[PDB]
Write a protein that binds this ligand. Structure first.
Ligand SMILES: CCCn1c(NC(=O)CC)nc2ccccc21
Ligand SMILES: [Cl-]
Ligand SMILES: [Cl-]
Length: 182
């Protein structure tokens, strides 16, 4: 009841509508992206610096690293929201890579509506240090967006883009989109 047609609007970018949201995938360097929110896939201590989390914390800077540890030593967090530092975003949302990916993406969507944000960029959450399988991760990300549209919750959010480090993982996401297409 929600899916549009899969097409390529720009070289290396693939998209489809999911209700009112445009869902996009591409391979590349997530630290070069501009969006209201960029998502970091990290550990339960919010201080992983390996793979995509290394690139995100290095680019963002030490004030963001200090924000993460300051919040981590205050309460038990499922995820944390910090400033963007020297990334091109308004906030970073740091999610735990080993957690249920559908739950993590649902939380990101809800927090973006609370701030009236329109754009999100995320990596293939859980496929790095957490070693979750790429088709399970693709299925979970897209299912979270579908549920969000189905509940009537999308109002400010208009664009969700996954920027994926390994081209082989992009191929898995594209196949999942084609399975769903309207
Ligand atoms: C040697 C390649 C390591 N690597 C990075 N590196 C970066 O993101 C740059 C520091 N991301 C990955 C994502 C998935 C799998 C391996 C990854
Ligand atoms: Cl991960
Ligand atoms: Cl990735």
């Amino acid at each position: 009841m929600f899916y549009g047609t899969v097409s390529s609007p720009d070289s290396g970018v693939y998209e489809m509508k999911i209700g009112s949201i445009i869902f996009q995938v591409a391979s590349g360097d997530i630290t070069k992206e501009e969006a209201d929110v960029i998502v970091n896939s990290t550990s339960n201590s919010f201080n992983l610096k390996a793979g995509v989390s290394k690139a995100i914390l290095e680019c963002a800077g030490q004030n963001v690293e200090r924000e993460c540890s300051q919040q981590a030593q205050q309460r038990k967090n499922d995820y944390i929201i910090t400033g963007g530092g020297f990334l091109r975003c308004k906030n970073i949302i740091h999610v735990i890579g080993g957690n249920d990916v559908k739950s993590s993406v649902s939380s990101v969507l809800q927090e973006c509506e609370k701030k009236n944000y329109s754009s999100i960029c995320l990596p293939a959450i859980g496929t790095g240090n957490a070693k979750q399988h790429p088709d399970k991760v693709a299925e979970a990300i897209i299912d979270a967006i579908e549920d969000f549209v189905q509940k009537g919750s999308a109002q400010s959010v208009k664009k969700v883009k996954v920027v994926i480090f390994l081209p082989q993982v992009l191929d898995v996401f594209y196949a999942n989109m084609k399975k769903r297409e309207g």
